[PDB]
Every structure is written in structure tokens, then in C-alpha cells.
Amino acid sequence: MDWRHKAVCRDEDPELFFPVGNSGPALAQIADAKLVCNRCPVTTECLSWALNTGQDSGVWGGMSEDERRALKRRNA
Numbered sequence: 001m002d003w004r005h006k007a008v009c010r011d012e013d014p015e016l017f018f019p020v021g022n023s024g025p026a027l028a029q030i031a032d033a034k035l036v037c038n039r040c041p042v043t044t045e046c047l048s049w050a051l052n053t054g055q056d057s058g059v060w061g062g063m064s065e066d067e068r069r070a071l072k073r074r075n076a
């Protein structure tokens with residue numbers, strides 16, 4: 001389970017770890033990782049990440065600030 005939780009960690013969207021440039025698909029790409037990464041269980045990486053970014057989370061997945069930007073733009 002632990003490796004699986006971090007399986008989706010690295011198996012998410014590189015766009016979630018890297019801020020989008022000027023493309024739109026990046027939002028859809030990022031958005032995909034966002035749903036798959038957010039619905040995945042929790043790991044020490046998830047808790048440690050939230051503390052590093054000061055984000056209130058525990059049951060959900062880990063998401064970067066740039067990632068949230070990609071999401072808001074995706075919804076428009």
C-alpha cells in the first residue's frame with residue numbers, strides 16, 4: 001500500500017511538479033494528475049508536503065501551489 005500511495009505520487013503529472021507555461025492542455029494534464037493524486041491514500045510524503053506548504057490536508061493527496069493554479073485555470 002505504501003509503495004502504491006507513492007506509486008501514484010511519481011505516476012501523477014509532471015505538470016503538477018512543474019508550473020505550466022503558455023499551454024492549455026497543461027491544465028487538463030495537470031487536472032488529471034490532480035484527481036488521481038488527490039483521490040489516492042495518504043503517505044508520510046503527503047503529510048510532510050502539506051506541512052512544508054502549510055496546507056490543511058490529511059485524507060486527500062498532496063498538491064503544490066502551482067498545481068492549484070493549473071486547476072483553477074482548467075475550470076475557468
Ligand code: SF4
Pocket residue numbers: 005006007008009010012037038039040041042043045046060061062063
Ligand atoms: S495524494 Fe499524496 S501519497 Fe498520493 S500520490 Fe499524491 S502526493 Fe503521493
